[PDB]
Design a protein around this motif. Sequence first.
Motif, short mmCIF file in Angstrom:
data_model
loop_
_atom_site.label_atom_id
_atom_site.label_comp_id
_atom_site.label_asym_id
_atom_site.label_seq_id
_atom_site.Cartn_x
_atom_site.Cartn_y
_atom_site.Cartn_z
N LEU A 195 -45.19 -8.53 -74.41
CA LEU A 195 -46.66 -7.65 -74.57
C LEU A 195 -47.25 -7.76 -75.92
O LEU A 195 -46.52 -7.66 -76.69
CB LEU A 195 -46.46 -6.22 -74.05
N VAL A 236 -51.24 -3.80 -75.09
CA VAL A 236 -50.81 -2.33 -74.99
C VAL A 236 -51.87 -1.46 -75.40
O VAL A 236 -52.18 -0.37 -74.90
CB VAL A 236 -49.63 -2.31 -76.00
N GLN A 269 -53.76 -1.01 -72.37
CA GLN A 269 -53.03 -0.37 -71.57
C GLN A 269 -53.36 1.30 -71.76
O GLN A 269 -53.45 2.00 -70.99
CB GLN A 269 -51.48 -0.60 -71.48
N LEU A 291 -44.93 4.76 -71.11
CA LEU A 291 -44.51 3.51 -71.63
C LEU A 291 -43.29 3.46 -71.90
O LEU A 291 -43.16 2.18 -72.09
CB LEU A 291 -45.67 3.38 -72.71
N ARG A 292 -42.50 4.30 -71.83
CA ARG A 292 -40.85 3.67 -72.14
C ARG A 292 -40.41 4.23 -70.79
O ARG A 292 -39.02 4.38 -70.41
CB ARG A 292 -40.29 4.43 -72.97
N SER A 303 -42.23 2.94 -67.40
CA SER A 303 -42.61 1.50 -66.68
C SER A 303 -42.98 0.58 -67.35
O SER A 303 -43.80 -0.58 -66.71
CB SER A 303 -43.69 2.16 -65.65
N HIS A 304 -42.75 0.43 -68.73
CA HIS A 304 -43.30 -0.61 -69.31
C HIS A 304 -42.30 -1.03 -70.38
O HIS A 304 -42.50 -2.23 -70.99
CB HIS A 304 -44.47 -0.13 -70.17
#
Lengths: 141, 129, 149
Positions: free
Chosen positions: C27, C32, C35, C53-54, C56-57
Amino acid sequence: GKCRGLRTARKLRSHRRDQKWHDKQYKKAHLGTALKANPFGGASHAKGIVLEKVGVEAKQPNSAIRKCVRVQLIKNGKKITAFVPNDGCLNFIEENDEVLVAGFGRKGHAVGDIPGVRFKVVKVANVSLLALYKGKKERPR
Amino acid sequence: VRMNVLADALKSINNAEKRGKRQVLIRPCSKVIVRFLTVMMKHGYIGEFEIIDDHRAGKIVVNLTGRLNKCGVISPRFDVQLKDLEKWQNNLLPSRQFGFIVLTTSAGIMDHEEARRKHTGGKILGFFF
Amino acid sequence: GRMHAPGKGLSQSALPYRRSVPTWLKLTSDDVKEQIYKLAKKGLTPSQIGVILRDSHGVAQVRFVTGNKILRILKSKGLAPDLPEDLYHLIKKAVAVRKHLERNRKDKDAKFRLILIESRIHRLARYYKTKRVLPPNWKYESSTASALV
RNA sequence: GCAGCCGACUUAGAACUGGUGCGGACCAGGGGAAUCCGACUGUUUAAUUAAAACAAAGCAUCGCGAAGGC
RNA sequence: ACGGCGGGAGUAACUAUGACUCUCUUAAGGUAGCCAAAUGCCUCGUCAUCUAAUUAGUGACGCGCAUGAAUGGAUGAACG
RNA sequence: GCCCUAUCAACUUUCGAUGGUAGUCGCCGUGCCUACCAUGGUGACCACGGGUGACGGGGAAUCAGGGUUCGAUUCCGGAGAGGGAGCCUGAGAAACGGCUACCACAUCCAAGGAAGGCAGCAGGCGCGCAAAUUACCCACUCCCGACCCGGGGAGGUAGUGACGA
RNA sequence: CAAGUCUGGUGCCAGCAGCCGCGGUAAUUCCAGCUCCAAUAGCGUAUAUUAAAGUUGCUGCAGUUAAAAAGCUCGUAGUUGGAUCUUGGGAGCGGGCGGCCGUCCGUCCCCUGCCUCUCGGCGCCCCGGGGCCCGAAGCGUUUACUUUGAAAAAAUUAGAGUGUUCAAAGCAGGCCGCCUGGAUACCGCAGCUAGGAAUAAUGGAAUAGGACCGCGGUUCUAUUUUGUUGGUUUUCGGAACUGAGGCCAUGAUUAAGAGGGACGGCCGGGGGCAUUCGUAUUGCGCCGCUAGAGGUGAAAUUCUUGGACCGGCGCAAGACGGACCAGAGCGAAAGCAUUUGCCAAGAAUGUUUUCAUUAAUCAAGAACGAAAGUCGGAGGUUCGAAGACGAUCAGAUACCGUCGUAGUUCCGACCAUAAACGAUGCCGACUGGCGAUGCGGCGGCGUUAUUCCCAUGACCCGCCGGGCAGCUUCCGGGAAACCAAAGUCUUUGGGUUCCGGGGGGAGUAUGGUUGCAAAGCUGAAACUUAAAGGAAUUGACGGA
RNA sequence: AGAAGACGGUCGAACUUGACUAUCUAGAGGAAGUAAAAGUCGUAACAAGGUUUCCGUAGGUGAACCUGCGGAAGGAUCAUUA
RNA sequence: UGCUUAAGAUUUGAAACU
Ligand SMILES: [Mg+2]
Ligand SMILES: [Mg+2]
Ligand SMILES: [Mg+2]
Ligand SMILES: [Mg+2]
Ligand SMILES: [Mg+2]
Ligand SMILES: [Mg+2]
Ligand SMILES: [Mg+2]
Ligand SMILES: [Mg+2]
Ligand SMILES: [Mg+2]
Ligand SMILES: [Mg+2]
Ligand SMILES: [Mg+2]
Ligand SMILES: [Mg+2]
Ligand SMILES: [Mg+2]
Ligand SMILES: [Mg+2]
Ligand SMILES: [Mg+2]
Ligand SMILES: [Mg+2]
Ligand SMILES: [Mg+2]
Ligand SMILES: [Mg+2]
Ligand SMILES: [Mg+2]
Ligand SMILES: [Mg+2]
Ligand SMILES: [Mg+2]
Ligand SMILES: [Mg+2]
Ligand SMILES: [Mg+2]
Ligand SMILES: [Mg+2]
Ligand SMILES: [Mg+2]
Ligand SMILES: [Mg+2]
Ligand SMILES: [Mg+2]
Ligand SMILES: [Mg+2]
Ligand SMILES: [Mg+2]
Ligand SMILES: [Mg+2]
Ligand SMILES: [Mg+2]
Ligand SMILES: [Mg+2]
Ligand SMILES: [Mg+2]
Ligand SMILES: [Mg+2]
Ligand SMILES: [Mg+2]
Ligand SMILES: [Mg+2]
Ligand SMILES: [Mg+2]
Ligand SMILES: [Mg+2]
Ligand SMILES: [Mg+2]
Ligand SMILES: [Mg+2]
Ligand SMILES: [Mg+2]
Ligand SMILES: [Mg+2]
Ligand SMILES: [Mg+2]
Ligand SMILES: [Mg+2]
Ligand SMILES: [Mg+2]
Ligand SMILES: [Mg+2]
Ligand SMILES: [Mg+2]
Ligand SMILES: [Mg+2]
């Protein structure tokens, strides 16, 4: 000390400046009403005028009758129990004379066996009592 | 909490002697403390230490010999002129032979025997013997 | 050492020495950023953003990949609320308590916790009146804070 | 935020002048420091006694469940 | 609920009122508290102050001819 | 750049308190004071108010280092001549061994009136536990004047003196 | 505290003695003799006072039991506040670790800016050009701290010189007209100068009005020269205002075993409001039989053939929630135990989330604070101050026994005190172990149920955080009992609040102030006394 | 040039009438307190002191002291069994 | 398997090295 900073001076000095007042020899001597209520008024001798001859018992193991003289002072007008030091020197003191009273020596405090007598006698009628006792001098007749 | 790290390290280096340790760990890394340890090393009181670097207040591991009686720290910090340093080493050290009051100046951190060389005085940090 | 509690607890995060990026994270630094423009435009607090973000990403810290942190990123566009979120939840708390005292007079405990929340308010708001994120005429008035919902 | 019209009464601040006189007549509280009795308001001996007397609120006792109590 | 609340003389370690009692007979025998008061004969009681001078006033002492507790005792702002 | 007290915590201000303008006075600068406008100034970093058997400083006694206590008293600088206000001459004084009044203390008188001030040196009264000669002299050091040349209880020399060394 | 058991008198009398202590018929302490001592022309007795006093404590005190930390948290002044920004290079001498570098140590020296392509250019190298190396003229945007330099009245003190016959003083005097002397040092706190840049504070760019570098516009002013001289225009510059640009490596230190905040499943007599159950206790009703039942050491007041006491069925009422319940849990402390439900709060742990010193302790001023007590309202089972009564006792107005008001319970307004005790302030770490117990988390042989098993439950063996505790020990301390803190303390200093200075008089007087009252917070002296008190040791003693 | 003298303003000591700091008198006697070789009535405390003591609060009694309702051990229990 | 069991005058003690 308990606080030890670099600019904590008005805390230290306004803590010592309060806690000095709880001393006993500072409070009696320095400001306060002890010099006010001293019968002498902050001095070492005082003249007086005899008004009566009385005796005082002694305290414990001891058993006697010590000799004391009720005195009224000149400069204030208060009343004091004095003390006749030597043997038989009560018989040289006649009524309505002048005596020169000196403090005893424990700084206004009871001494020995005698209950509550602060002050003693040095001179009688401007004749020193050690000479009137010994014999070097004689009462002015 | 910690108002002085140098003052919680010289006590953490005081409590390892009266037990009789060999090596010890201190938590914060001051530049003051580092210049302090490399003052005691030149006189050989301790061994050669080392510093541990994370991206934080780093750590220090000190090796200890057996010539270190007591390391101290003064609180608070003062100003000491040349006519006061006599009246500190009069009554803060055992004798006039050894012992080392250490004090920062505008020239750097040094002991008092050196401050007499350079004719300089400044703020005090502590003492060690 | 806590503020208003005698506890002495020790439980928090611990970032490692290694600041640098992983390898499977393909990414971009600005994908980001989109996002985040998506998530905060929908509406979510900056901390819950760093949780989504930690979860599902697969990113550990956003500071390590981009240049700046989250709120400072949002700050350069205009998506941040004026009052910070931790003040917001200490007003939502002091409101739900003043309501419970209003319907319950004999609750001395909620009477006791109200004074301490009021102290952590009149203690923060003069941190922010010196960091200058607020006008110096912002005041936690008691009976009108519920308007500032 | 301006112009023009009509219009009621009061309050405040200065100036001048009179033989120290000015609420000029009428109207219009003498005052303080203490004791006794009664809490106060109120009422009465019409035609000799208006008070320290009765009353009064408060307080407390007693009989009586209806064929009964008074 | 009407009503009642007296007595027997000294007990020490100097005056000595008097400790603690003595002492008990006919139902218990004046506690808390107040005074020469609107109630106290002796009486203009004694002491201090108020006056040039005070049988009255105010403060105190109590042995009270014959003070006293809902026949009510002591209280205190306002009012007459 | 200072002593004790919070059983003194709020003060000042049309009774000039803090400032602006123009003046008056005065040797000059300013609310120092009038006239007009504004409503401000100090304070827990102890303002304000009260005490002090407080005259201040140079310094003295004990002390390792730190400090405590005393400094009325011969040198410097200020205040005051019974208490308080007023003013002349003069370069300079609100002077008192110079004047004008009040209050308190006080003298001579023919009863009409007059005059005064030791906290200057000596010496008495008093108050006190508590402290000296009513002596001699301008020679010394110095000051005043019209001035080599006259004066000075400032001062010096003696008398008392077991403060003490 | 140096020095008579000498002799004669009084006999707890008279008297000495600063303190302990002497005197009641042989007094080393009294009045006298003899003798003896210490200081000597001086010595004692009073009072004020300094040292001794680390018994006022900044250097340098104490606070478990002896005097001593507010009942508990919050909190404005105040005091104190984590880590982080620049390393260095040559010139010389003294010298010894080593096969002329040297690995060199010691020590001095040199290598801050231009506002000067305007001062204005003193020399000096460089090739009329500006020009180099460099005396000074006049800023360089800071305090705090430290060193230097001027300046600071004499006397005094400390101190050299001198032989007033020495000495304390004094500044003179010493040689055959001569030679001198009459010194120095020291002199805080602030202000002026002059250098220093560790530590300790405080500053810039993040709504980029950014900092330089130049091109374009609009208003301005001073002069020398277009001959002497009058409107106007510029050059040259020295002020604003203002358009598009180029450029820096173009700009946000880390994220505390400091702190706040979000999420996640859990926990507990934590707190408030409602809901429900339980025997018992007293009382009442109807039945069932009969002369005693209560009650103490022993008895009596008290009840009873109008049927008490016991047995059964029922019924009301108001309190209290055992046994389960432990050196277990929670709460800031006081405090909190029947079931069920609702309303919000909070610790610990997990966390590769968040903001980036927001924190620590706290004068004035505030919230809560068991019992008892007060003014009101409901409700009054049981106990039960005051009271009456029966015994006991010499006397009991007391313990013992029957009855019993005020109160005990509920809602509403007050009061703010306890051995509110761990009789040990709060934050911070630091330095030995050994078993346990409780929440959350991390693994693991294996049994146990679910059966159809990963996963959830119950045991078992380990690890980690913090929470009440425990044994054992020559860490260490302490007057000792005793303590992983009462330890890290003469080898004395981590930060920061309140409070004690012999005993009593006394937590009293007065003065304020809150309170309806009871009472509470601040809070002295006068006088009076040499002991009062804490820890252990031996003995005698106990209706232990 | 000017002696006395007056108008009013100024400076203003001083006099009759209100509040604060420190000192004093009869001081009741009501009330206390302490201190004095030998007095009276009692037994609360120290041994389980013969009713285990002590703090806080209210009520009573010739005197010490008694009795209630929630605490503490500075006590005579560091403990009482599946 | 617990009843009661109050009281007792003021004074009077001190040790050296050879
Ligand atoms: Mg100290
Ligand atoms: Mg004695
Ligand atoms: Mg805090
Ligand atoms: Mg009267
Ligand atoms: Mg009437
Ligand atoms: Mg009539
Ligand atoms: Mg009539
Ligand atoms: Mg009577
Ligand atoms: Mg009267
Ligand atoms: Mg009667
Ligand atoms: Mg009555
Ligand atoms: Mg002077
Ligand atoms: Mg010292
Ligand atoms: Mg001193
Ligand atoms: Mg002079
Ligand atoms: Mg005059
Ligand atoms: Mg004058
Ligand atoms: Mg004269
Ligand atoms: Mg005179
Ligand atoms: Mg004089
Ligand atoms: Mg002359
Ligand atoms: Mg003269
Ligand atoms: Mg002589
Ligand atoms: Mg002697
Ligand atoms: Mg002394
Ligand atoms: Mg002590
Ligand atoms: Mg104690
Ligand atoms: Mg306590
Ligand atoms: Mg308390
Ligand atoms: Mg001078
Ligand atoms: Mg800093
Ligand atoms: Mg149960
Ligand atoms: Mg307070
Ligand atoms: Mg009640
Ligand atoms: Mg009862
Ligand atoms: Mg009784
Ligand atoms: Mg109650
Ligand atoms: Mg209440
Ligand atoms: Mg506290
Ligand atoms: Mg004392
Ligand atoms: Mg004692
Ligand atoms: Mg006798
Ligand atoms: Mg007893
Ligand atoms: Mg018992
Ligand atoms: Mg008892
Ligand atoms: Mg009783
Ligand atoms: Mg009872
Ligand atoms: Mg005990």
